[PDB]
Design a protein around this ligand. Structure first.
Ligand SMILES: [Mg+2]
Ligand SMILES: [Mg+2]
Ligand SMILES: [Mg+2]
Ligand SMILES: [Mg+2]
Ligand SMILES: [Mg+2]
Ligand SMILES: [Mg+2]
Ligand SMILES: [Mg+2]
Ligand SMILES: [Mg+2]
Ligand SMILES: [Mg+2]
Ligand SMILES: [Mg+2]
Ligand SMILES: [Mg+2]
Ligand SMILES: [Mg+2]
Ligand SMILES: [Mg+2]
Ligand SMILES: [Mg+2]
Ligand SMILES: [Mg+2]
Ligand SMILES: [Mg+2]
Ligand SMILES: [Mg+2]
Ligand SMILES: [Mg+2]
Ligand SMILES: [Mg+2]
Ligand SMILES: [Mg+2]
Lengths: 102, 203, 147, 210
RNA sequence: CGCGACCUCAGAUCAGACGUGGCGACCCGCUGAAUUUAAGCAUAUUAGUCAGCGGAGGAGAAGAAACUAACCAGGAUUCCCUCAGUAACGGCGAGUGAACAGGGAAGAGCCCAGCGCCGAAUCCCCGCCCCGCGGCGGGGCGCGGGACAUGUGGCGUACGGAA
RNA sequence: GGCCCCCGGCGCGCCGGGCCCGGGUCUUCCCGGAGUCGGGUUGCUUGGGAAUGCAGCCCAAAGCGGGUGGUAAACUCCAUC
C-alpha cells in the first residue's frame, strides 16, 4: 500500500537498475594456478618444512590441536593466518597417514 | 621457468637447504671487507625484479652494515636538556639498514648511479646487502632507451636524497588515510603548506 | 587612519593613558588563557560556564557530509516555487495541487513551523516532521518520501 | 588576562609564523601569466577545442552532493566499448578515458554512451594528409569550420524534470510518512536481533523433538 | 708436471670514459636543541623549528590507487578556495590540529621482472670505405675481438595478455 | 615605422635508410615482485585516540590470498583496492 523509496531503513536509497559487468582482472590476484601449484609443492619436497611447522605437526599428531593453534598464533601472528596454517598442517599430516597405509 | 622455482625456494628461508646456504654465505661474507664488488648477483632472480639486466655497465657491490639501533652520540650521557630528551640507548634511526647500505655503495662509487638493493643474509652483528649500480655514461646504457632515464642528472645520488625503493620507505608516503603527513611532496612540504600564513590581498 | 586614533591625543602626557601608579608592564596576568583555574577563575566561571571538563562521546573519523540534512519550514514552502504555481491553483478547478520537490531546492528535511495556506500540495522530501506531515494533510495534501 | 566577557580564544601565532607569511602580490601577475599561457595553448592546438578533451558526466559521492552532477575524469571502458570506440584511439580524438572507473548502474552508463555518440556526430576529424582517405570529413565541414570551441566541450548542465500537478489519490493522502520513517528506522535497528531470537526459537522447536 | 677450460681474485703512468670542489633563495634525505609559554615545573609547548651533516635541479619532491567512500557513488600527483580552528590530541591546562567530499589552476599517461613463444633473433668495442662532423652519428663491409644462456632483444603487464 | 646582420621556430622538394606495422567475434592457454607482508616490541613521530607513520630487535606468512574499511577481539556477510 504505497511503497515510496526512503532515504533510511534496510531497503533504502535510490532505486536504480544494476548492470552486471565483467569483474576487473585485478580482482583475480592470488588465485592459485595449476602450474604455480606444481612449482609450490615441487619445492616443499626439496626444501621441506620449517622448525615451528614441524613442532606444530608433532602437537597435531598428539591431538592436542588447541595448543597447536595457540603455538601457531604466537609464531605467525594473527589468528586467521594461524588457523589457515593449522589446516594445511593437518592436511599434510593426513596425506602422510594415507601414504603410510598401503 | 627456473626463476619462479628459485623465487619459491628463497621464500623457504627457514628450510634445511636455504638455512645451510645462508649460514655458509654469511660466514664467507664476514671473512671479507665491508665493501667489495661481487662479480655477479648472488640473487639473480631478485636483481631482475628490481631491474638489473645482465648486460655491460650493470654492477653489484655487496656491502656490509652493522646491525642494531643508534645510540645518541653525546659524551658520557649528558644530553643536557629537558628530561624528555634524556634518552641515549633505546632509540632508533629513521632510515633502514638497507638504505644505509645503498647510501654507502653510492658514496664510494660516485660515478655509479644506485638503482636498487636486496638482502643476502644476517649475522647478529652485521647485515649484508647487494646494491645494483649503473654507469650512466656507458654507451650500452646511454643508447638503450629504456635505461637512459638514469643518465639524466636529476637522478644523481638517488640514495642520498631518499629515492631508491629502500630509502623511499622512511619518508612515509603512500596514498590513503594512513599518511596525510606527506600530502604534498613530502613530510617537510606538508608542514610547510600547513604553516604558511597565506595572507591575501583583499582579506 | 592614525590621524584619528588615540595615541595622537596622548602625545605630551607621560603615562600614555596607562597610569603611573601601576604602569604598562609586559604580561602581568600571564600570557593568554593562563590561570583559567587559578587566579583568573572568576572570569572563566562567570562568563564561560562549563569551559573545564570532558563530556559526551568521542567520534574519531567524523565526516560532516554523512549528517547533511538542511531543513525547511512550512512557513515558507511556497517560496520554493514560482508564485504562478501557487496562483494557478486557487483557480484551475480540477483540484490539482502542484508538486513541490523540496530536495531540488536543497532541503532534505521538512519541519513544521508556521501556518500553511489552505491550498493543497504534494511535498516530495527525504524526511518530514510529525507536525509538518499533519499540517500538510490538514491543507488537503500528501507528503511523499524520496530517496 | 581576560576582562569581562569575550570568546576565550586561541590564536595560532606561537610558532615563528612571520618567517612563513605568504603574500599575494603575485596574483595579478600570476593571473595574466596563466591567461597568456592559456591563449598560447589554444593557438598551438589549432582547430581543437581550447577546453581539453571531452569528459564524462558523473554524479558526486555522499548524501550531500548526491543530487548534483559534474564532469568526471574520463569515460570508462564499458562506455567506450558500447559506443564502439577503441580505447587507444579515443585518446587521439579528444575523448578523456580513465580506466579505473567501475560502472555500477546502467542509468549512468547509457547516458555516458549517449555523450560519446553525440560527440562523434558533431566532431570534425581532419584527414592526415591534405589528400583525403576514409573517416576524414568533407572539405565543406572543414572550410566552414577549422574553428575552436570556446569553453568546456558539450557542457554538463544539472537539470530538473518538471512534475505536473496531479490530483492526490486517496492513498497518497492515506500515507503516514513520519510514522513510516519511524518504523523503517526501528526495523533496521532491530532486524539483527529479531533474526537471532527467531534462530533461537527455531533451535528450541528442533530441541523439543530430540 | 705439464698444457688447457672456467671460478674467484690481484697488478698496470694499459685504451677510453666518468666521480671529487663550489653556490645554496627555492628543493630532497637525515640530525635536532634551548631560550620561550604554562604566570612555578618535570609531560606538554617552543618544534621536527635554529644550529649540524648529506645530495639536487631549473625547479625539486610527488605521481598513475594494496585510494576515497558507504553515494543514485567518485577515480594519479601538485596548487588555490573551502572544509576548519572543525574531527581529534592535551598535567583534557597551556595550548595544538588534519583528512574526504564540493569548487577551481592543470591535466598525460606509461614501462619491466615474471609467465610464455621466437636458431641470442640482442649489446659493446675494434678495423676499412662513402656521407655527416663546435650536442661523435648514419650507411655499407670484415671468420676482427668481447658481453650474454647464472638470460640480451621483439611481442606482452592486470585497463587483462598470448596463441 | 624603415634598412641591415645573425639566430630560432615552423612550411614545401629531393635523397639515404628504416617500416608489411589493424580491429572486432568464438575457442584454447597465461598470469604477479619475501627476511616482504603480518605479529610482538621497544624508541621517536602523528590530530590519529587499546599503536597515524618511521625504526631497531625477535618471530615470520599466504594464494578464492593479501591490504584497507579511524575502538581491542571472535564469528560472519558485503564493499574496495
Ligand atoms: Mg618538555
Ligand atoms: Mg614496510
Ligand atoms: Mg587606558
Ligand atoms: Mg610611568
Ligand atoms: Mg594594572
Ligand atoms: Mg580546465
Ligand atoms: Mg657538489
Ligand atoms: Mg614558565
Ligand atoms: Mg613569568
Ligand atoms: Mg623557573
Ligand atoms: Mg611538536
Ligand atoms: Mg637549517
Ligand atoms: Mg622529478
Ligand atoms: Mg604504485
Ligand atoms: Mg584526492
Ligand atoms: Mg566557520
Ligand atoms: Mg605540533
Ligand atoms: Mg623475458
Ligand atoms: Mg610530539
Ligand atoms: Mg570497528
Amino acid at each position: 500500500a504505497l511503497r515510496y523509496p526512503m532515504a533510511v531503513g534496510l531497503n533504502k536509497g535510490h532505486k536504480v537498475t544494476k548492470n552486471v559487468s565483467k569483474p576487473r582482472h585485478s580482482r583475480r590476484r592470488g588465485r592459485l594456478t595449476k602450474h604455480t601449484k606444481f612449482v609450490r609443492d615441487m619445492i616443499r619436497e626439496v626444501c621441506g618444512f620449517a622448525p615451528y611447522e614441524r613442532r606444530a605437526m608433532e602437537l597435531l599428531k598428539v591431538s592436542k590441536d588447541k595448543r597447536a593453534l595457540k603455538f601457531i598464533k604466537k609464531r605467525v601472528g594473527t589468528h586467521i593466518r594461524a588457523k589457515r596454517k593449522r589446516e594445511e598442517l593437518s592436511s599434510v599430516l593426513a596425506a602422510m597417514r594415507k601414504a603410510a597405509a598401503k | 621457468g627456473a626463476y619462479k622455482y628459485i623465487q619459491e625456494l628463497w621464500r623457504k628461508k627457514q628450510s634445511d637447504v636455504m638455512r645451510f646456504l645462508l649460514r655458509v654465505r654469511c660466514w664467507q661474507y664476514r671473512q671479507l671487507s665491508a665493501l667489495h664488488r661481487a662479480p655477479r648477483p648472488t640473487r639473480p632472480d631478485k636483481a631482475r625484479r628490481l631491474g638489473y639486466k645482465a648486460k655491460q655497465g650493470y654492477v653489484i657491490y655487496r656491502i656490509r652494515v652493522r646491525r642494531g639501533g643508534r645510540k645518541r652520540p653525546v659524551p658520557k650521557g649528558a644530553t643536557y636538556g629537558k628530561p624528555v630528551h634524556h634518552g641515549v640507548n633505546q632509540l632508533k634511526f629513521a632510515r633502514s639498514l638497507q638504505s644505509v647500505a645503498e647510501e654507502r655503495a653510492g658514496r664510494h662509487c660516485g660515478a655509479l648511479r644506485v638503482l636498487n638493493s636486496y638482502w643476502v643474509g644476517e649475522d647478529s652483528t652485521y647485515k649484508f646487502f647487494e646494491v645494483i649500480l649503473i654507469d650512466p655514461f656507458h654507451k650500452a646504457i646511454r643508447r638503450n632507451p629504456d635505461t637512459q632515464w638514469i643518465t639524466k642528472p636529476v637522478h644523481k645520488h638517488r640514495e642520498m636524497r631518499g629515492l631508491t625503493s629502500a630509502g623511499r620507505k622512511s619518508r612515509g608516503l603512500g596514498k590513503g588515510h594512513k599518511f596525510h603527513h606527506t600530502i604534498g611532496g613530502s613530510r617537510r612540504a606538508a608542514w610547510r603548506r600547513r604553516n604558511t600564513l597565506q595572507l591575501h590581498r583583499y582579506r | 587612519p592614525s590621524r584619528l586614533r588615540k595615541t595622537r591625543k596622548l602625545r605630551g602626557h607621560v603615562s600614555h593613558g596607562h597610569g603611573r601608579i601601576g604602569k604598562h608592564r609586559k604580561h602581568p596576568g600571564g600570557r593568554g588563557n593562563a590561570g583559567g583555574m587559578h587566579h583568573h577563575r572568576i572570569n572563566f566561571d562567570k562568563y564561560h560556564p562549563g569551559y573545564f571538563g570532558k563530556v559526551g562521546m568521542r567520534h574519531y573519523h567524523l565526516k560532516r557530509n554523512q549528517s547533511f540534512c538542511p531543513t525547511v519550514n512550512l512557513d515558507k514552502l511556497w517560496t520554493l516555487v514560482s508564485e504562478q504555481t501557487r496562483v494557478n491553483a486557487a483557480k484551475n478547478k480540477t483540484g490539482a495541487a502542484p508538486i513541490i520537490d523540496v530536495v531540488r531546492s536543497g532541503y532534505y528535511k521538512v519541519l513544521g513551523k508556521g501556518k500553511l495556506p489552505k491550498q493543497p500540495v504534494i511535498v516530495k522530501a527525504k524526511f518530514f516532521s510529525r507536525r509538518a506531515e499533519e499540517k500538510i494533510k490538514g491543507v488537503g495534501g500528501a507528503c511523499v518520501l524520496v530517496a | 588576562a581576560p576582562s569581562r566577557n569575550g570568546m576565550i580564544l586561541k590564536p595560532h601565532f606561537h610558532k615563528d609564523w612571520q618567517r612563513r607569511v605568504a603574500t599575494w602580490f603575485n596574483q595579478p601577475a600570476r593571473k595574466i601569466r596563466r591567461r597568456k599561457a592559456r591563449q598560447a595553448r589554444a593557438r598551438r592546438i589549432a582547430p581543437r577545442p581550447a577546453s581539453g578533451p571531452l569528459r564524462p558526466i558523473v554524479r558526486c559521492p555522499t548524501v550531500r552532493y548526491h543530487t548534483k552532477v559534474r564532469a568526471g575524469r574520463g569515460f570508462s571502458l564499458e562506455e567506450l566499448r558500447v559506443a564502439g570506440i577503441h580505447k587507444k584511439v579515443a585518446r587521439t580524438i579528444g575523448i578523456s578515458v580513465d580506466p579505473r572507473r567501475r560502472n555500477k548502474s546502467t542509468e549512468s552508463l547509457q547516458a555516458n554512451v549517449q555523450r560519446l555518440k553525440e560527440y562523434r556526430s558533431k566532431l570534425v576529424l581532419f584527414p592526415r594528409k591534405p589528400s583525403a582517405p576514409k573517416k576524414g570529413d568533407s572539405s565543406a565541414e572543414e572550410l566552414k569550420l577549422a574553428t575552436q570551441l570556446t569553453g568546456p566541450v558539450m557542457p554538463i548542465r544539472n537539470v530538473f524534470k518538471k512534475e505536473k500537478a496531479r490530483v492526490i489519490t486517496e492513498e497518497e493522502k492515506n500515507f503516514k510518512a513520519f510514522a513510516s520513517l519511524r518504523m523503517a528506522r526501528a526495523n533496521a535497528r532491530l532486524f539483527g536481533i529479531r533474526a537471532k531470537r527467531a534462530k533461537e526459537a527455531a533451535e528450541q522447536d528442533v530441541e523439543k523433538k530430540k
